Amino acid sequence: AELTPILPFLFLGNEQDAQDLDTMQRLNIGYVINVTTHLPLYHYEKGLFNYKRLPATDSNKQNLRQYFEEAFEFIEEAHQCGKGLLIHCQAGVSRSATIVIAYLMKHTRMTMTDAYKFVKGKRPIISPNLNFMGQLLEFEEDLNNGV
Numbered sequence: 001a002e003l004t005p006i007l008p009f010l011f012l013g014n015e016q017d018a019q020d021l022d023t024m025q026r027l028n029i030g031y032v033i034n035v036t037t038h039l040p041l042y043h044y045e046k047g048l049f050n051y052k053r054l055p056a057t058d059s060n061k062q063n064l065r066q067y068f069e070e071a072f073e074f075i076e077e078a079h080q081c082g083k084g085l086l087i088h089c090q091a092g093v094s095r096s097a098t099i100v101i102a103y104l105m106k107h108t109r110m111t112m113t114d115a116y117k118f119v120k121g122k123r124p125i126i127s128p129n130l131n132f133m134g135q136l137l138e139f140e141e142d143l144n145n146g147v
């Protein structure tokens with residue numbers, strides 16, 4: 001089980017990574033973003049983490065931009081109190097990688113391609129999604145136009 005550390009407090013995984021309770025505690029994680037409609041909130045009944053579900057599918061019609069601001073406020077809440085955040089979806093981490101890159105574009109001022117090269121360097125297997133790609137391109141333009 002590999003929870004990829006993108007930033008010192010931001011971790012990226014899939015469904016399998018999200019079920020390793022011991023590693024999550026070793027990484028000082030206290031926040032979890034579940035970017036699926038159907039997976040459970042793993043370890044919810046143990047009362048150890050704050051959870052947020054963004055109910056998305058890995059399709060060519062899913063809107064992920066709508067969840068960006070909601071996800072950034074949760075990331076910054078963990079960031080500001082010294083805890084780690086895990087964001088995960090499924091196999092090819094397409095959905096969760098979109099939100100991670102969007103954060104890097106907004107809160108690190110990286111371009112879209114520099115953000116992708118940074119993420120791909122730490123987690124080499126990332127499945128493409130042309131729809132999510134197109135939304136990050138419009139997100140980059142809205143950042144550059146102060147919107």
Ligand SMILES: CSc1scc2c1-c1nc(SCC(=O)C(C)(C)C)ncc1CC2
Pocket residue numbers: 093094095097098101112113116126127128129130132133136
């Ligand atoms: C911003 S992504 C990007 S920018 C320039 C390229 C790419 C790219 N990405 C991917 S996979 C990553 C994804 O599709 C999501 C994270 C959006 C789900 N495969 C191939 C390429 C070719 C070149």
